Design an enzyme around this catalytic site. Sequence first.
Site, PDB file in Angstrom:
ATOM      1  N   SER A 172      -1.485  -8.231   3.782  1.00 23.34           N
ATOM      2  CA  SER A 172      -1.889  -6.832   3.969  1.00 23.34           C
ATOM      3  C   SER A 172      -2.044  -6.165   2.616  1.00 23.34           C
ATOM      4  O   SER A 172      -1.132  -6.191   1.794  1.00 23.34           O
ATOM      5  N   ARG A 173      -3.212  -5.589   2.337  1.00 24.47           N
ATOM      6  CA  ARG A 173      -3.520  -5.137   0.977  1.00 24.47           C
ATOM      7  C   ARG A 173      -3.044  -3.733   0.674  1.00 24.47           C
ATOM      8  O   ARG A 173      -2.918  -3.368  -0.488  1.00 24.47           O
ATOM      9  N   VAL A 174      -2.682  -2.963   1.691  1.00 28.97           N
ATOM     10  CA  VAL A 174      -1.874  -1.758   1.495  1.00 28.97           C
ATOM     11  C   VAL A 174      -0.405  -2.097   1.195  1.00 28.97           C
ATOM     12  O   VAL A 174       0.253  -1.385   0.433  1.00 28.97           O
TER      13      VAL A 174
END
Lengths: 183, 36, 100, 279, 114, 114
Positions: C26-28
């Site tokens: 997950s890039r957040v």
Amino acid sequence: SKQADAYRAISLLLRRPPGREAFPGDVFYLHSRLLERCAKLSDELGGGSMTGLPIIETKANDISAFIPTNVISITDGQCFLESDLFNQGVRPAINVGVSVSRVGGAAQIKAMKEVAGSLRLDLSQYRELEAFAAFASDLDAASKAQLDRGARLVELLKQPQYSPLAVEEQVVAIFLGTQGHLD
Amino acid sequence: LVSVINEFKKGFQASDGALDPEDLEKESVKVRKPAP
Amino acid sequence: DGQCFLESDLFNQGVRPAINVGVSVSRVGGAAQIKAMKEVAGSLRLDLSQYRELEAFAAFASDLDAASKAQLDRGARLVELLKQPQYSPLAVEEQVVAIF
Amino acid sequence: TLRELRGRIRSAGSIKKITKAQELIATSRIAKAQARVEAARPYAAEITNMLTELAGASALDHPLLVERKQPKRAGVLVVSSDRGLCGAYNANVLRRAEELFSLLRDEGKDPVLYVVGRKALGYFSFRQRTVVESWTGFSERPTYENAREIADTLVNAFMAGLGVDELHIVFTEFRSMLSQTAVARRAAPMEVEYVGEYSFEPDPETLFDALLPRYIATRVYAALLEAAASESASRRRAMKSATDNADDLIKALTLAANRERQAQITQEISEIVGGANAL
Amino acid sequence: PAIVGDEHYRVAQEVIRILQRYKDLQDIIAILGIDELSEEDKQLVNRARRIERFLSQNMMAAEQFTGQPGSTVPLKETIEAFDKLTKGEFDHLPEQAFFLIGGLDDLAKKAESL
Amino acid sequence: PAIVGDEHYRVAQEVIRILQRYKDLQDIIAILGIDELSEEDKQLVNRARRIERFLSQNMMAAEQFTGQPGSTVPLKETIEAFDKLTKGEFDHLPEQAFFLIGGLDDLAKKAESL
């Protein structure tokens, strides 16, 4: 390769029919009528000559793509350069186990024939033996020497860029290896 | 929380957990004298 | 912004939900977690992916280094911890302690 | 897709090179091992002759020649490889070992186990029976120095009767390069074979009581050399098998990679030409 | 587990896990054979090959080809047999005994003839 | 080597050679196991598995990925650290010590933690 890609761009914009790999039908003829203009003329035409070094770039080392297959079928000899040999230190990365030339000895001077004659055989025997490098104690001495020769010939064939050797210096370089003085 | 985990761990309960005599062969010592 | 790549050959071997921890991301990331979970879990994806690389490598090694054997056993503990049955949601207050 | 098959073809083509290399290595080592066996034989043939001439004069009453009055417990030695890739070798040894243990427990005795070679140590640690002692890191080249310690330990465990009422060895006999098998035999107590018809210093009894332990050491040493020669021959066979299996895998993968290449090209053409015919 | 009950579901999941681990080891099995595997895996593959063969049945339809009669086994006998197989209560029988059986008494009857 | 100097070029080319040799050996190690390899190849593999993890770095933008703050490693320190790695002067450190670590000062402190 970018020649063929430009001619594909032009031909598709002109609504000519596409064939394999989207190339127009005549792409073999496009490369052939270029390359077959390289030749050696006879003495009646002044004995001039033209030598072609076409480069091509292969995707992921395949040689079954359309343009590679055409240019391999057109040309007289094929120096395969492989990125794996490049990384393993063999620079320039000539895959001496698969590159060939159809002209052969007729292009070499006698002093080069007298030396290089066994070189391809020594490197073929070394490439066969290569797996036994891990167990070289248990190997028969008569082939342990072939392995140690082959490893020195592979070092002898490396070369730094922009430093081409004249023929009289490379013959002496190959003499060191082939005549065993380097061992 | 660590104290509760260590109190609890002492109280946990884990789920902890044809040959033939004629084919068998005999070593021998030989003697060059006839059997008694 | 991120992948929960569910792989059938993890699902069959009991790892449910079958998240392939190598590819999944997950890039957040830890900007979208409560402080306790960022403390407790703040590297867990990298530790499980390193375990899956090590478990693949050591599959046929006859012996292992002390640190290697520790990491390989810790990873099997974490993989058994992350399994979960259908319709058994955990409140975040229970999830923090479980990962702790 | 094609990229996995290109990778798997390259992988298999490396494995084929590495197995063929080891097959040739094993084909050399079986000659080294047979050379060691034939170099050891002329000692064992003379120790045997000397032992029989001593037994001809001796009382024949050494503990190793007399059975116990009621045996309860029997020592067994199993010998096994230190390296993998041997194929059936360790499985054949360990199957015979269990078959012997089900003979002994069918007679009433319980086996106490001694192990040579890390493979059998890993087997008897997975199945829950204890090993009394074990030795590793020489089954590829046994030297008499190891057979000395093993024979000492086994003979000390026998002469104690914790103690044992018998000694057995499980190993493999090298019958020929193409054929070998595991074998289990009793090392102690020993049978005495009378057959049809010297000075001794200081006495025949004392010499015989010193020599018998050294005969037991030379027999376990000869068994370890047979084990190593048979192991390397089984490694040769299992590696020739692995090479053939990799060659058939490279064939099948190549035949898949070609059907994929052709299908990919035909799909790419169908897509282009459909695009053109839409215009 | 809500529809079929826990005793069915747990067995089904254990069977699938065993067959999955076998279908992963297949890549080594094809080159080196069984013998290279560690004991924790070789124990599994030995019963995987048995579970796999035991999922065969002599169907009523095939009687017209093989000449063997057909077989029907109730759910309960199926659950009991696969629970025993996964735990290992049949591991000592040869793989060939398991083809085209049906139920546990027919397994026994076949294994006795070998 | 005319631009970056021969030290940089040598270290770069040695590291690439090691990683290339490791990528050739992975297909073997995954089936036959590292115990089968030559002593020189097994040593190279142990150097490569470290080099790979010492090419990782805690970046300043990955604060929300790793929680640890970022670090900047000077060019000379980079050259000297990889030079030491290729000659094996860090082979006695445990494999996990290099991961995400940054420079040699951090490497020492994390090895001393383990």
